[PDB]
């Protein structure tokens, strides 16, 4: 019920996590 | 002696002549460019292994 | 299928070489 | 006086850097799902077994225990105590004694990070902690009157996990270190439910931690999980295989290319109790070679004794002792006994090699491969005649594989033909045996269809290379 | 290598085996 | 005389592999064991032939005399080492490491030969104690003198004296360099043959060429091997030489066969009955007549075998279990027919071949590719 | 005889070495795929009556029907003709009362002299471009990989 509400933004936080990880890459390369 | 590019027959008597196959080239310098591949590849394997 | 061959040891070369220049230069640094 | 100090230099640094960036990973940078600790963690799968096994009764590591199980860590005055008390924590070894923490003191120092007002937001620094206790017992090989103490902490261990699935579990991913920790302890663990029955209840949370992921977190520790069920589901190995094939279980893909061996072992020995040998003997193939690293580790010995075993099954011959090793030449002597009879056709000889080391093949777990070995010694005979003659008739075989009957002799060429042995075709107007050639191998769509998936992992190499990248 | 590197055959019957066989009933009355 | 040494190894082998077998090569023997050798392995052969007698008496009794000989220059040195040159001169052991290298026994004699490398930096002189070490080497059967010491022997001392001194780097051969491997490395360091005169090592320079003729059957089949044993002189010489040897060529250059199968018994008679026969000679009779069968078996696409018969020897069925075994085994490519005694051959075309050997070798590249990549990066 | 040979095989470890001394009219079942896996065939069928202890007569006859299915069903494919003496030996018995029960089993029907009628065999048809649509696809993806930005 409310532990869902919790699972459901660990997935996602995840996903933010893991897509904020590989912009910098495409920053670094922007930048050089 | 490769002076003929025939094969004989033997028992029925028949000089089969035909020619020699052309090309295949290509593939020789791509085997030879995979083993030296290879050597790149453990030397590669050797820089990785050494500094981790 | 050689081309592609080719191609993924210089990929491979470039991340060992990028991840060895940064971790010795972060040793350095820290 | 000269053995003690410099382990006790090494052996505190080594972890103390370890906590210390695995802490400063792990929540400086969220993207810690593979961090360069977990490297770390690889270096104690070798570093311990070798490092230290007993306490080291010289006042050296003894004293490591009681420092590392007192954190309290609240803040950065705490955090900067801890370092002043390292120092006293430190010379206590040198200089007075070293505590006797004589293989008791591991379950009241649970509580010894919850001592002393600690506050546990690290919760790897507590799975580290955990994991420790193994160190001085079960890394130390006794299991003499002292298994209840590594029960203990275990399901202490095991309420860690549960602190992990309810205190606090707000994207950590402390998991994906923490069943590597629920592999190393539960090998020895498992060795411990080696030595006593079958192990029910690690089943059963076997099984709810095996579904406790995935849906959760899926990185790595499925695969061990799957692995560790299966051993013993191999174990006791009575009908169990078939659950294991309907075991939608091929999930695991990364497995650091070391796991993944194993569980291809495993996989392909579940395939190859079950008559197909020809599916076997290309997973046995790729196991072997998937994590060559070391010579002998003992993965290699029975992998390679359970290969040309199901090769010889299938009715190829290759020679056992062509890698002849520190523990390859002399560990298949009668294994390269057995080989040599296939060659030929004496089945008197085999006879006696078999009943002459008998109890080396039941040690070796190889129990059944005579209830289908005599059938080979026929068929690979046959194929040999198959490869040699192109077109050999139906009274010649009967004497050039001595099998009495010319009926007989015309009955194994009516099975090898069906399960697929050699393309030869029999008729009943001259009785000769006649195969056909292929020559539209490279004339035909076949490379084309070999070069694309060559093509496609080769190019996909580079997209994962280039996708880990500069971190300025 | 040791003294034979690998392979080989150990069938134990093939010494000038041609020379048994001319030798085998004269060459099987030189055939 | 360390460099007629090697008599020990010569006719201590000459006897002691075919003295199973050797009956008046044991009377040969007696008069070279106590009369020329170097120390008490004289005895050793007590262990397999007879108690022996008379070898116990004179032996002893001169080499305590050679030791009662051994002050020598030693002393002499001791009394001229008074000036101040080098706290040595060239009068000692360094000078009189004949005795104890030739008389020595290896046990004591490897020491010696150490000692007497503890000595002057001269290249020629080190050279010529390595190749003394080597042949000490091949006097017991050692196998790791002749491992360890030739890689010093050819590139450690190969700064200076080179292309004269390659000459005696021939020793390389039928060594531990060259086991019963009789092939390309072997067979080209016997085809640099660039000599008709003695230069000692295996003795006989027409046993050197029969060895080389030999070596050359198992090195080509006809890549160019018309020019290498066939078109030269002094090789035709020693031919003209040795009328048997030159038969043995002969009867597969011409591509005569038949009596080729003779002179392969001939060769049995010498195969095994020489003193190289620890290692067997079965490596090299199976791979001439794989090579006498593909010599046949090329340009003959539908080859009855009852010419093949004729054209071989006798031994019909012989020629049927003898493919049956060959082509099985994974050599000579064909498909001979039982019945209608038709051989017929088939050759894969160059684009098969070649396409299983690029698949193989991409194989093995994409796994190590792919594990280099576990490696880094987790 | 329910052609279940995996069962048989992962079956087979319930006694990890009892069987071999013990298991006598065991012994019958066990050795029925070794002799199956051989040209026993004929004294499978003349071992079809000397069971030891007690009859149970059932699953020998099952195993006589599956051993003559399978080897009904097994050579239609490889072999091109019969005659009437080049399969009643070779299947069927020494010619037995199912003579008319193999008569009507399947083709090739057999009875006057000869076994003729119902011959099996193939044509093999093939156009193979068929997937050059498919390798367009392959080679554009091909582009795709070389040109989407990492």
Known sequence: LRQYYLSKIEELQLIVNDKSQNLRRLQAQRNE | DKKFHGILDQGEGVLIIFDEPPVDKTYEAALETIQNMSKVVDSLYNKAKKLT | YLASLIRSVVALHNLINNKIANRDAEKKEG | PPPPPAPQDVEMKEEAATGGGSTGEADGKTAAAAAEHSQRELDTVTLEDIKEHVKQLEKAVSGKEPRFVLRALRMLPSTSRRLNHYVLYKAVQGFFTSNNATRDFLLPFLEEPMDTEADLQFRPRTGKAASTPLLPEVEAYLQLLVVIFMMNSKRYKEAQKISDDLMQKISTQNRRALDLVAAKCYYYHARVYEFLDKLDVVRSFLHARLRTATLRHDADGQATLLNLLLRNYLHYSLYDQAEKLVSKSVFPEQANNNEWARYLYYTGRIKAIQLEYSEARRTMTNALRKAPQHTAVGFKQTVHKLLIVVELLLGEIPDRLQFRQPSLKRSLMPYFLLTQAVRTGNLAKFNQVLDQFGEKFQADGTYTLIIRLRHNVIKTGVRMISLSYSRISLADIAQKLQLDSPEDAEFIVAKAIRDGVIEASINHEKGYVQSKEMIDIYSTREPQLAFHQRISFCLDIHNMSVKAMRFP | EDNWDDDNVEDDFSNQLRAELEKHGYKMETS | ?378 | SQNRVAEFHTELERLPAKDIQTNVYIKHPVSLEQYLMEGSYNKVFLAKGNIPAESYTFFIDILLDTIRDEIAGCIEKAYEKILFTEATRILFFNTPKKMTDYAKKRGWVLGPNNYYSFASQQQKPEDTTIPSTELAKQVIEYARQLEMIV
Not at chain 6, 78 to 99: F, V
Not at chain 6, 161 to 189: S, T
Request: negative net charge; hydrophobic residues 40%; glycine residues 4%.
């Open chain 6, 1 to 378: 005389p360390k460099n007629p040494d090697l008599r020990i190894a010569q006719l201590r082998f000459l006897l002691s592999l075919p003295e199973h077998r050797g009956d008046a090569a044991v009377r040969d023997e007696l008069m070279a064991a106590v009369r020329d050798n170097n120390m008490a392995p004289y005895y050793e052969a007590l262990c397999k032939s007879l108690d022996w007698q008379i070898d116990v008496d004179l032996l002893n009794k001169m080499k305590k005399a050679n030791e009662d000989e051994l002050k020598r220059l030693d002393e002499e040195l001791e009394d001229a080492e008074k000036n101040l040159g080098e706290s040595e001169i060239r009068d000692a052991m360094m000078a009189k490491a004949e005795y104890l290298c030739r008389i020595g026994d290896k046990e004591g004699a490897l020491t010696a030969f150490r000692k007497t490398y503890d000595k002057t930096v001269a290249l020629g002189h080190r050279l010529d104690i390595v190749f003394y070490l080597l042949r000490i080497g091949l006097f017991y059967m050692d196998n790791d003198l002749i491992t360890r010491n030739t890689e010093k022997a050819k590139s450690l001392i190969e700064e200076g004296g080179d292309w004269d001194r390659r000459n005696r780097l021939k020793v390389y051969q039928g060594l531990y360099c060259v086991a019963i491997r009789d092939f390309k490395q072997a067979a080209e360091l016997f085809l640099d043959t660039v000599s008709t005169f003695t230069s000692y090592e295996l003795m006989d320079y027409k046993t050197f060429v029969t060895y080389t003729v030999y070596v050359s059957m198992i090195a080509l089949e006809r890549p160019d091997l018309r020019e290498k044993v066939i078109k030269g002189a002094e090789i035709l010489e020693v031919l003209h030489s040795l009328p048997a040897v030159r038969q043995y060529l002969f009867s597969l250059y011409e591509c005569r066969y038949s009596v080729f199968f003779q002179s392969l018994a001939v060769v049995e008679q010498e195969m095994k009955k020489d003193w190289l026969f620890a290692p067997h000679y079965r490596y090299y009779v199976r791979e001439m007549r794989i090579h006498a069968y593909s010599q046949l078996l090329e340009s003959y696409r539908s080859l009855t075998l009852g010419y093949m018969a004729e054209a071989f020897g006798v031994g019909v069925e012989f020629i049927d279990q003898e493919l049956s075994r060959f082509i099985a085994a994974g050599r000579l490519h064909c498909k001979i027919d039982k019945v209608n005694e038709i051989v017929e051959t088939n050759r894969p075309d160059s684009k098969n071949w070649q396409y299983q050997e690029t698949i193989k070798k991409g194989d093995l590249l994409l796994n190590r590719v792919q594990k280099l990549s576990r490696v880094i990066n987790m």
